[PDB]
């Protein structure tokens, strides 16, 4: 009876910025996915490569829980084959993704009267992200011929920008917490299984 520390991920008091998205490896434990999948708390719960109802009977070598906060209208970007600043520069899912994307509105936690500017995202990158790649660099983005040499100015832009989370905003601009579960089946003993495995 080792249950998986999902509450540590789903109920964590603070979430990471999407550009520095948190990853937690889940290993050597019993996981009840039924409770998550059947919870009305999650407005988004779309799986790729797996049936959610079948999870309670499967075993996996490992499970990863990636978490971050984005804007409501950016949740659509957390899916295979999407484009946009979030999919391109912050968090990319492979075309062969095997896992589930979970999201719920966090306006009551991540909004502050006057704007919460603690959650950041990457707006500039010379290059798209590879699937599951993380880029936490803060080098000035050189958009021109001239080098920036660590000073911001014309064509020399800081690569991260802050979200403005105000409780007044429309739903599309409110913060959403997102948890992406990936299911890995490697040539090794499976350590994560559902209760009815």
């Amino acid at each position, epitope marked *: 009876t080792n249950l998986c520390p999902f509450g540590e991920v789903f109920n964590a008091t603070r979430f990471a910025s999407v550009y520095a998205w948190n990853r937690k490896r889940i290993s050597n434990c019993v996981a009840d996915y039924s409770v998550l999948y059947n919870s009305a708390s999650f407005s988004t719960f779309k799986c790729y490569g797996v049936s959610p109802t079948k999870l309670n009977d499967l075993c996996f070598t490992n499970v990863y829980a990636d978490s971050f906060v984005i804007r409501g209208d950016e949740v659509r970007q957390i899916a295979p084959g999407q484009t946009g600043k979030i999919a391109d520069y912050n968090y990319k899912l492979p075309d062969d993704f095997t896992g589930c994307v979970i999201a719920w509105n966090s306006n009551n936690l991540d909004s502050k009267v006057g704007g919460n500017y603690n959650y950041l995202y990457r707006l500039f990158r010379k290059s798209n992200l590879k699937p599951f790649e993380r880029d936490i660099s803060t080098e000035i983005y050189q958009a021109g011929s001239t080098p920036c040499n660590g000073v*911001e*100015g*014309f*064509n020399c832009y800081f690569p991260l920008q802050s979200y403005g989370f105000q409780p007044t905003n429309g739903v599309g601009y409110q913060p959403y917490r997102v948890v992406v579960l990936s299911f890995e089946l490697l040539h090794a003993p499976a350590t994560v299984c559902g209760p009815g495995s």
Partner: antibody, heavy 114, light 110 residues
Framework: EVQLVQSGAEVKKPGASVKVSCKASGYTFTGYYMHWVRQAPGQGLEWMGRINPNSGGTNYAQKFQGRVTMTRDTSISTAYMELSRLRSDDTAVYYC???????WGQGTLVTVSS | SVLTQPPSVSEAPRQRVTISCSGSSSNIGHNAVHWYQQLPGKAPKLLIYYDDLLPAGVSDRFSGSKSGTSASLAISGLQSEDEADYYCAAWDDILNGPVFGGGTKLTVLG
């Protein structure tokens, strides 16, 4: 909060010189370019030049080459613009502005009259 | 002056106005356009940077775009507080520095 506070209004005679100061607050002074932009009363904005506050390198608009000096004192986070041999048509509000003009000083009126 | 803007534009409150910024190959063609708002008797303020990006705290009623050697600023939901002079600016490769447009006075018809 980022703030750029400039020195007060100046009255200078033609031929004299004016030195305007710009005190920066709320950020790392050496991490961002500083520019000087002027605006004659009721007219458009005109870029005069820029200074790298880290290296101290300067670059000036052609029409002010030989007449303007831009400097910086990092110990008090202040940038300076000195315009020499003043002419009547140098009467203007002079602004300092940071980086890609993402923050502006409140402006300094310089009236050149004999 | 180096970039050419309309001297004047006007529209009714709650409507949409557009302000054009016209350049050449050396500036807009190769470099990012920026927009500034100058309220009467005040200093300019940044509105748009890198063609379409908004600084923190700038309302999404303001948007910008660039196509070729030209750029435009669009103001939707026009408010009377938007009355101001608007200036575009971009880096110019030939003159080795940032150039300005002549500015556009926006009137919100009251």
């Amino acid at each position: 909060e980022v703030q750029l506070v400039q020195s007060g209004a100046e009255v200078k005679k033609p031929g004299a010189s004016v030195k305007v100061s710009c005190k920066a607050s709320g950020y790392t002074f050496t991490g961002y370019y500083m520019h000087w932009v002027r605006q004659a009363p009721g007219q458009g904005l005109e870029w005069m030049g820029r200074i790298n506050p880290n290296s101290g390198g300067t670059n000036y608009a052609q029409k002010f080459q030989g007449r303007v000096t831009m400097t910086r004192d990092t110990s008090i986070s202040t940038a300076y613009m000195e315009l020499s041999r003043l002419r009547s048509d140098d009467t203007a509000v002079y602004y300092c502005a940071r980086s890609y003009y993402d923050y502006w000083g409140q402006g300094t009126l310089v009236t050149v009259s004999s | 002056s180096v970039l050419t803007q309309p001297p004047s534009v006007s529209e009714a409150p709650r409507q949409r106005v557009t302000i054009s910024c016209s350049g050449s190959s050396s500036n807009i063609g190769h470099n990012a356009v920026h927009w500034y708002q100058q309220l009467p008797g005040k200093a300019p303020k940044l509105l748009i940077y890198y063609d379409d990006l908004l600084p923190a705290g700038v309302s999404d009623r303001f948007s910008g775009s660039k196509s070729g050697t030209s750029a435009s600023l669009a103001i939707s939901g026009l408010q009377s507080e938007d009355e101001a002079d608007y200036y575009c600016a971009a880096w110019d490769d030939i003159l080795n520095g940032p150039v300005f447009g002549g500015g556009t006075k926006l009137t919100v018809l009251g």
